[PDB]
Amino acid sequence: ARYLGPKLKLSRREGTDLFLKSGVRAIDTKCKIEQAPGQHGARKPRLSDYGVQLREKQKVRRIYGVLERQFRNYYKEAARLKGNTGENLLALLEGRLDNVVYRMGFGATRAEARQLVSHKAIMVNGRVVNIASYQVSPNDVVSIREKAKKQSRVKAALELAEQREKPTWLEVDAGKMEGTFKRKPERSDLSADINEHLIVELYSK
Amino acid sequence: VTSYIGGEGHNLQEHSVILIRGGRVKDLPGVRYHTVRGALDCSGVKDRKQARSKYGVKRPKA
Amino acid sequence: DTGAAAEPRAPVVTIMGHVDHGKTSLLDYIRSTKVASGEAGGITQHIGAYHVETENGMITFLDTPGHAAFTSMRARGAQATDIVVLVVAADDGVMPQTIEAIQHAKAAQVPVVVAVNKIDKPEADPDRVKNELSQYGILPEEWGGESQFVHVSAKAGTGIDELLDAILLQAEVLELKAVRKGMASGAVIESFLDKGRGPVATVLVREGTLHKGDIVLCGFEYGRVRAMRNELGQEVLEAGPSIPVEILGLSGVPAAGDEVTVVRDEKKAREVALYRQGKFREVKLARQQKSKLENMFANMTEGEVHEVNIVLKADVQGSVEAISDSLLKLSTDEVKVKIIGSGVGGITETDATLAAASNAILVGFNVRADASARKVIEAESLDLRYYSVIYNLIDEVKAAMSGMLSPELKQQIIGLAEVRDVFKSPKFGAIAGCMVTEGVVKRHNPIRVLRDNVVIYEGELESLRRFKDDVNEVRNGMECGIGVKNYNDVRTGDVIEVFEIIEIQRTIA
Amino acid sequence: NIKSAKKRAIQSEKARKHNASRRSMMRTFIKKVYAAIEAGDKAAAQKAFNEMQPIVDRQAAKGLIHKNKAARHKANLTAQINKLA
RNA sequence: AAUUGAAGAGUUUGAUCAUGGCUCAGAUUGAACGCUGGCGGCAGGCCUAACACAUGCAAGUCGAACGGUAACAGGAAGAAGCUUGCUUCUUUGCUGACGAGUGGCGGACGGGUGAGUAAUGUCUGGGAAACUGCCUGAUGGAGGGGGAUAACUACUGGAAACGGUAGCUAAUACCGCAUAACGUCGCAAGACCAAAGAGGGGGACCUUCGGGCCUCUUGCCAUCGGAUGUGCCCAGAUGGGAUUAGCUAGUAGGUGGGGUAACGGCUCACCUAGGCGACGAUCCCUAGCUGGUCUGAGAGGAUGACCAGCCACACUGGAACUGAGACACGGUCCAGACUCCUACGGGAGGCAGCAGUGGGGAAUAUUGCACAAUGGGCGCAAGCCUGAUGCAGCCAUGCCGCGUGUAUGAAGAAGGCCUUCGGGUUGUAAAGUACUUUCAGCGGGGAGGAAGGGAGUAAAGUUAAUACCUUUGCUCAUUGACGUUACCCGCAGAAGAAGCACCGGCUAACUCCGUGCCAGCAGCCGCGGUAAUACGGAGGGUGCAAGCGUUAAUCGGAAUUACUGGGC
Ligand SMILES: Nc1nc2c(ncn2[C@@H]2O[C@H](COP(=O)(O)OP(=O)(O)NP(=O)(O)O)[C@@H](O)[C@H]2O)c(=O)[nH]1
Ligand SMILES: [Mg+2]
Ligand SMILES: [Mg+2]
Ligand SMILES: [Mg+2]
Ligand SMILES: [Mg+2]
Ligand SMILES: [Mg+2]
Ligand SMILES: [Mg+2]
Ligand SMILES: [Mg+2]
Ligand SMILES: [Mg+2]
Ligand SMILES: [Mg+2]
Ligand SMILES: [Mg+2]
Ligand SMILES: [Mg+2]
Ligand SMILES: [Mg+2]
Ligand SMILES: [Mg+2]
Ligand SMILES: [Mg+2]
Ligand SMILES: [Mg+2]
Ligand SMILES: [Mg+2]
């Protein structure tokens, strides 16, 4: 249920930083951004109108690390919900447990966030949760258990977590090593460079 | 009925009943089927590496 | 197979010989059964193992018939058994089938004890047997070669006491190694197919242990045992390394014989069984490509291309491999015979269909027609023949082959005639007046027209006409007339040779 | 197979021979009614009606003729005996 | 708050625009094959031969219905080998129980199957001329007699199944008499119909000292109702074909008789000459139908697996009995096909029950565990039976979730591939360094599915009675097939776990080499005859992921049957 191959190849193919290279050091420097995606990737960037719809599908999926079958269920769930389907698509992806672990800054990367959640270190409202796909709703507290607390893996992430955006929709805390999800994020608070109108089109046909 | 044999070369003749999947591709006059290589008594394509799913070629140990 | 536990076992014994030494009689008398001559053929064409309880201890008996045809059965029966017995008759002496059994005893490094079958007949003497088999290193007596001879009536039922003792002792002098509990393993005697019960096998278990829940793997076949049957006994709960028990519940009919090993779980044994199939299938296609490419030409270099096809399904698995080898012995260069789709048992739709595509005889050692089988056989023109014995089969297949031949060995001249004073006809273009010097000229018999000893033209007569009579036959020294189509030039002095055509017929050998 | 209702099979055989005899005698009283109706005897019609009345209603109480069949005999045969009379 | 949502591309021609077909992108399946494969949850799993079957099991249960000792668990009596305290072996139904048999209830339910049936069917909506055990409400009888019989004995026919003759014995078996409206039959007067006891305990007038009787529980009988189920009738809807246009004698209707529980040509005699039909009769072919499932924006189209309702069928064909209910899956009788047994006279069997085998077919499973739980059958209850059901095994068949590491790491290493030999790419990938131990493996702890039932007590309700029984508290012993349960904790160590298709355009993703109209690809237009991004291999890449791809089937696209929504 995971990629396991090279994370930067996914970032180089899209031509945008997916934040899988967050870790200790960030903002690339060493990159080779686009220019040679493969061996003959230096060929002209002209691409079909069908392909750019499929390209944006991969851009969103490769950030969070979701597979097409698992992603189809979130699109199917986003369609049945009220309001805009595109806005609810990213909302259900943002409602994942491992993503909320990444935003608060417990995991350094999004892959490490799923890695830490898999070992049952994260507890929500007291009870432990193994599954990274667990749906987080408003007024749901989250925290790391007494076992594996204040380790060099989790401690290094929380230090450098302050340097990033620091999202408004949840409290960072990091004093007692817990967190709280206040409300569902707004359209202005996410997306921007990634588009919702492009990704949604491909499943209509 | 009649059926095309895919792949490079075969041992197929006379007896030893073989599997026939079907499907239409147009080359000979009136050929509406295809034989399955690497099934029942039908030999697979020797020394093939790409497209192992088609033609019944097993994965080499490495 | 852990703990290294060593427990004594009942010795498995096989018996070999030339047909007719009353090899079966020895068993049946001990078994107090006498099933001999109760079955078709009067002789034993099948293999079976029967354990009896007699002092001292326990012993089981196995028997294989000795014939040119059963090359495999006697080979496998020797290596499986700890002790081999060779029956010999003072009247029969030594025979080429008996010496064949000698090799199976030494090559399998199995100790051998023998018995003189006839003490009843006055023309039978032991001294003849000892001396004539003396030449062969096997069967020494009191020469320091440790081998012991037994003299039994086999009809009289006379001991026997000595033979039995030798067998017990011969098994006693050598250490008997087995284990009561552990990993079960062994060999398969004979396998066949049943309609209600399903596919079954008769298995000798080297290490003796069994259970209804235990998974067993025979060759490339795998499965859980549904039930256990021992000889007459319909059900047995437990089976030891000594006594044989028929196994049931296997996926399909296994090989006629092989090594069988039980496993803890079936899932782990699935990949192994499928692995053996892949190798057996790979060599099957391998041997298929070689035989076809071996000729290195698009056809046969000569006229032996005419062949006969046969379809065989025998109830027992042991026969189809064994008798086919004997069925390939009768094969000849002229007419080639080949087996197609050897079955495990009975008959089936795809089998009758197999004989429908290519014309063939459908035969079985022992088989019955299925309800769906009768409909196909009765509709299209075919032949269903079942034979109790292999000898009646081996004879008729040859018969089928002998008939196939179409040889005419005679091209003797019927008459020879010289033509003179040609006449003209509208229909044939020419009429050559003739005078028969020898023999009788006939209408439809072929002719050879030759001039100066070389043949100018050849053909078959269309019209034989003398005057306006147009008689079909003309004798010698009687004026005659002749004409033929496609013959342009008639010249005097040439002679026409008419000859009848006859077929000698052919036999196979 | 030796199974369950072979006890009930011979009971139904006994019940058949019992009921077939009781149904046969039941009808013979009804059979004597139309003998008087087809003939010119008015007295024997009413006499035969009073003979069948006790026995036929008794079979309805037993639960073999099934209530309304026994009632229908008296319903039809009332209209026939007083037709000519 | 609740059926709120609609994609096109390629291909006729030198090129264009219409018309028009073919093909592809989508989703789905009771799937299969090919390759590959770690675990868990839930669901599904003979679509073809309604082809045939070995063995076990699938319906039995009441001594609180009644004769009974055929087993063994006690007690009792008696005779013995002896140990003065006990065993041993024949009698005894006194008893805890119980083989076989009689009787009652259930074998008409549960389960399976899609052969028939294009309408005695199903669906939807009504109607009156009917029945309905077990279970309930209402009002009364349960009085008094006789004659059998299985079992078991005495014989005898039989290989077996299974009887025959002659005695003996009870009953909630069976049959009379008496009793009789609120019932049935009648305009009325009248006529006429039923039964069964058994079990627990007990003062009083008490027994031929069986128990009457009082009382409680349960059952029987009759009638008017309730509920449920079943039967019957009408309307509408529910396949194709006009290359089937005429089809019907019980056929349509009436009267009378008989018949069904009940209306009726349901079935007869007689009378009349109608009935159905172009709004598709009849005939032929095909098919269970519906709630729904699949697809679709909707309308439609296709489809009737599992789940659930109804109908039909139970080796083939036909018939009736028992019973409230069957014209009966594991009942009986007869005929047909076919299996087994036999002393050859004569019997026995029906897996379209659960497993499973022969065989069909591309192909679909274990001859498992348990009544622990739900729900039936019987019984007062205990309890027994239950292949229904609950569970396990098997298969990646489908759906969903998780893992096969994460982070750092330039020497942009080695090797492979390409290279105009400057290098580029594989590539933060690997190695190395720093961390974690999920799911597997190993060792511990431990929910819930369990309420009851059983044995002692207390009060209350029945009652002549603080008996007894029932109900309601309380206390003490318990009842888990699944089950090395779910789950939680600890240990070791990145250890055990990634393949598959495709890359000419459509269609996301390109070079080299080999082969040279050869060998081959292809879903469509088409590629290859010496620079092939189309073949084969390698490198690289893309899509998807314990799946992947191909084929087959249905719809969409297809406004290409166009009602919505097209033309001549
Ligand atoms: N005179 C005599 N004849 C005997 C004796 N023993 C056996 N026989 C004969 O042998 C015959 C039986 O032979 P059998 O055992 O069937 O031979 P077989 O063992 O089947 N031969 P194979 O093994 O090759 O199939 C009988 O007919 C009998 O007359 C004996 O002691 N004396
Ligand atoms: Mg998945
Ligand atoms: Mg001889
Ligand atoms: Mg495999
Ligand atoms: Mg009437
Ligand atoms: Mg049972
Ligand atoms: Mg009993
Ligand atoms: Mg009496
Ligand atoms: Mg009665
Ligand atoms: Mg009245
Ligand atoms: Mg009365
Ligand atoms: Mg009475
Ligand atoms: Mg009428
Ligand atoms: Mg049908
Ligand atoms: Mg549409
Ligand atoms: Mg029938
Ligand atoms: Mg009846």
Ligand SMILES: [Mg+2]
């Ligand atoms: Mg088959």
Ligand SMILES: [Mg+2]
């Ligand atoms: Mg390099």
Ligand SMILES: [Mg+2]
């Ligand atoms: Mg674990």
Ligand SMILES: [Mg+2]
């Ligand atoms: Mg519990």
Ligand SMILES: [Mg+2]
């Ligand atoms: Mg509870």
Ligand SMILES: [Mg+2]
């Ligand atoms: Mg592209």
Ligand SMILES: [Mg+2]
């Ligand atoms: Mg290819």
Ligand SMILES: [Mg+2]
């Ligand atoms: Mg080239």
Ligand SMILES: [Mg+2]
């Ligand atoms: Mg349409």
Ligand SMILES: [Mg+2]
């Ligand atoms: Mg048009």
